[PDB]
Scaffold this active site. Structure first.
Site, PDB file in Angstrom:
ATOM      1  N   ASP A 275     -14.818  -6.281   8.681  1.00  0.00           N
ATOM      2  CA  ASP A 275     -15.108  -7.386   9.676  1.00  0.00           C
ATOM      3  C   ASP A 275     -13.848  -7.155  11.021  1.00  0.00           C
ATOM      4  O   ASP A 275     -13.753  -8.525  11.510  1.00  0.00           O
ATOM      5  CB  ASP A 275     -14.646  -9.083   8.821  1.00  0.00           C
ATOM      6  CG  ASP A 275     -12.551  -8.435   8.398  1.00  0.00           C
ATOM      7  OD1 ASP A 275     -12.338  -7.634   8.205  1.00  0.00           O
ATOM      8  OD2 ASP A 275     -12.534  -9.133   7.577  1.00  0.00           O
TER       9      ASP A 275
ATOM     10  N   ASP B 203      -6.497  -2.261   6.961  1.00  0.00           N
ATOM     11  CA  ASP B 203      -4.881  -2.360   6.230  1.00  0.00           C
ATOM     12  C   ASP B 203      -4.654  -1.178   6.247  1.00  0.00           C
ATOM     13  O   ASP B 203      -4.706   0.176   7.226  1.00  0.00           O
ATOM     14  CB  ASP B 203      -6.162  -2.385   4.465  1.00  0.00           C
ATOM     15  CG  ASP B 203      -6.787  -3.195   4.538  1.00  0.00           C
ATOM     16  OD1 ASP B 203      -7.088  -4.320   4.586  1.00  0.00           O
ATOM     17  OD2 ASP B 203      -7.975  -3.154   3.452  1.00  0.00           O
TER      18      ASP B 203
ATOM     19  N   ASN C 232      -3.403  -6.237   5.215  1.00  0.00           N
ATOM     20  CA  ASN C 232      -4.999  -6.507   5.688  1.00  0.00           C
ATOM     21  C   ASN C 232      -4.496  -7.249   7.328  1.00  0.00           C
ATOM     22  O   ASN C 232      -3.557  -8.675   6.798  1.00  0.00           O
ATOM     23  CB  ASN C 232      -5.539  -6.886   5.304  1.00  0.00           C
ATOM     24  CG  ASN C 232      -7.060  -7.340   6.018  1.00  0.00           C
ATOM     25  OD1 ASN C 232      -6.844  -8.416   6.774  1.00  0.00           O
ATOM     26  ND2 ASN C 232      -7.326  -6.582   6.624  1.00  0.00           N
TER      27      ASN C 232
ATOM     28  N   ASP D  60       1.743 -16.092  -2.848  1.00  0.00           N
ATOM     29  CA  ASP D  60       0.316 -17.182  -2.548  1.00  0.00           C
ATOM     30  C   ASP D  60      -0.844 -17.789  -3.127  1.00  0.00           C
ATOM     31  O   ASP D  60      -1.470 -18.910  -2.290  1.00  0.00           O
ATOM     32  CB  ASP D  60      -0.212 -16.154  -1.399  1.00  0.00           C
ATOM     33  CG  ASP D  60      -1.206 -15.731  -1.140  1.00  0.00           C
ATOM     34  OD1 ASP D  60      -1.976 -15.404  -2.967  1.00  0.00           O
ATOM     35  OD2 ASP D  60      -2.173 -14.443  -0.457  1.00  0.00           O
TER      36      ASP D  60
ATOM     37  N   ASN E  90     -11.401  -2.504   7.953  1.00  0.00           N
ATOM     38  CA  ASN E  90     -13.025  -3.188   7.281  1.00  0.00           C
ATOM     39  C   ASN E  90     -14.010  -2.867   7.844  1.00  0.00           C
ATOM     40  O   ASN E  90     -14.247  -3.513   9.304  1.00  0.00           O
ATOM     41  CB  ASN E  90     -11.894  -4.554   6.738  1.00  0.00           C
ATOM     42  CG  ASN E  90     -10.621  -4.527   6.262  1.00  0.00           C
ATOM     43  OD1 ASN E  90      -9.435  -4.400   6.018  1.00  0.00           O
ATOM     44  ND2 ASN E  90     -10.895  -4.077   4.917  1.00  0.00           N
TER      45      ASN E  90
ATOM     46  N   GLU F 286      -4.094   1.914  -3.727  1.00  0.00           N
ATOM     47  CA  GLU F 286      -4.276   2.089  -2.511  1.00  0.00           C
ATOM     48  C   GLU F 286      -4.400   2.896  -1.761  1.00  0.00           C
ATOM     49  O   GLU F 286      -5.114   3.294  -0.689  1.00  0.00           O
ATOM     50  CB  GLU F 286      -3.728   0.539  -2.457  1.00  0.00           C
ATOM     51  CG  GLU F 286      -3.778  -0.378  -2.584  1.00  0.00           C
ATOM     52  CD  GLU F 286      -4.905  -1.430  -2.660  1.00  0.00           C
ATOM     53  OE1 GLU F 286      -5.736  -1.079  -1.859  1.00  0.00           O
ATOM     54  OE2 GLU F 286      -5.411  -2.369  -3.360  1.00  0.00           O
TER      55      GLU F 286
ATOM     56  N   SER G 256     -11.080  -6.547  10.593  1.00  0.00           N
ATOM     57  CA  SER G 256      -9.665  -6.112  10.499  1.00  0.00           C
ATOM     58  C   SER G 256      -8.939  -4.730   9.767  1.00  0.00           C
ATOM     59  O   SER G 256      -9.807  -3.896   9.975  1.00  0.00           O
ATOM     60  CB  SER G 256      -9.161  -7.003   9.317  1.00  0.00           C
ATOM     61  OG  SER G 256      -9.969  -6.770   7.999  1.00  0.00           O
TER      62      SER G 256
END
Ligand SMILES: [Cl-]
Ligand SMILES: [Cl-]
Ligand code: NA
Ligand code: NA
Length: 129
Positions: A48, A52, A59, A101, A46, A35, A50
């Site tokens: 969209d 990271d 994110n 989650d 990203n 990562e 957003s």
């Protein structure tokens, strides 16, 4: 801060990640390598809109607030800049929420594609733990 492999393993162990939700320490070290290349200051944007953040590339659409991701949740209740610290506590505590989650470590695309199903114990081989 750019961590060494064993230095990060030790830090993650002290913070309770070894076997957290059943994921051995080598999984967490492998995910960090691909990562962020073990760099706490890593950021990537990203498609969209957003971004990271940090050693585990958390994110801003769901987990932290960066002031520029409209409609985002802040489920870890932290500014995204706290995830870039040389102290990994905030990143670890948020990662524990993520991995709990429902989807386990499949939330991290690089873990799914580069660590899952491989000999992840090799990432901690040789370290004094
Ligand atoms: Cl392991
Ligand atoms: Cl990937
Ligand atoms: Na090291
Ligand atoms: Na957000």
């Amino acid at each position: 801060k750019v961590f060494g492999r064993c230095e990060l393993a030790a830090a993650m162990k002290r913070h309770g990640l070894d076997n957290y939700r059943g994921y051995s320490l080598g999984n967490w070290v492998c995910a960090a390598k691909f990562e962020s290349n073990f760099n706490t200051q890593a950021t990537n944007r990203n498609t969209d809109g957003s971004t990271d953040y940090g050693i585990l590339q958390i994110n801003s659409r769901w987990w932290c607030n960066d002031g520029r991701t409209p409609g985002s949740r802040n489920l870890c209740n932290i500014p995204c800049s706290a995830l870039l610290s040389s102290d990994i506590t905030a990143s670890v505590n948020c990662a524990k929420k993520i991995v709990s989650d429902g989807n386990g470590m499949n939330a991290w695309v690089a873990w799914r594609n580069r660590c899952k199903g491989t000999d992840v114990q090799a990432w901690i081989r040789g370290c004094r733990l």
